[PDB]
Design a protein around this ligand. Structure first.
Ligand SMILES: [Zn+2]
Ligand SMILES: [Zn+2]
Lengths: 133, 136
């Protein structure tokens, strides 16, 4: 398993395809793609524990955390509502204990302040992360 | 005990939830749930290789086979178009080489004749599918 993909969907217009690639076991995972239908600005971007969409994104459960492992920061939507995603992350994995295959990728309503807010709302869209060609 | 779950959806009315449970890594996998929106009768029931929903059920690629590993026989819909599923399989797994987590469960248009259709000389289109996810 060196490649994965996730199709994000929700009750609103938020949708996108997010690719994952990890060329070396235990190596960094590159995450890239595009999300549209977002409000301009920052949106929390997280892997949640369960790849369970039985009740929409709510059944994905909590932030994945065997920074939390699943915490992928924010994505940034432009004035057109489009977020172009290009991240490299050394904590998530496509195998082993930190493997995110079969878990859920979520884009949030609000910005994640990363715990540095000086003193991220609903789940707009999600999908199960699957093995890709 | 590993647990997995799959929500099936597709281009038409076919929808369902299928659960997986495997008590030990070398034990059988119980598969159970229900699918609705089906024509009465048999429908091929397969794990396909890729958990890729970029193109409906088509991007799932081929039948999973590292009978084929992904071949889970057929499911049987009743007169209400509902197939109640309860299967035990000792070839698929929720870990290791035959792991189906991150792959795609597919329910087909037609029966899979299981290679016993009587003409050595077929499941048809994919009605619904879902990526198989880790469950609580
Ligand atoms: Zn989150
Ligand atoms: Zn098939």
């Amino acid at each position: 398993a060196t490649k994965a993909v996730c199709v994000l969907k929700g009750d609103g217009p938020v949708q996108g395809i997010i690719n994952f690639e990890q060329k070396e076991s235990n190596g960094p995972v590159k995450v890239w793609g595009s999300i549209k239908g977002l409000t301009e600005g920052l949106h929390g971007f997280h892997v949640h524990e369960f790849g369970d969409n039985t009740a929409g994104c709510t059944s994905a459960g909590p932030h994945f955390n065997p920074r939390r492992v699943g915490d992928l920061g924010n994505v940034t939507a432009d004035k057109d509502g489009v977020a172009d995603v290009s991240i490299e992350d050394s904590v998530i994995s496509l195998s082993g204990d930190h493997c995110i295959i079969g878990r859920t990728l979520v884009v949030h309503e609000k910005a994640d302040d990363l715990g540095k807010g000086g003193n991220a709302g609903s789940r707009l869209a999600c999908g199960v992360i699957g093995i890709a060609q």
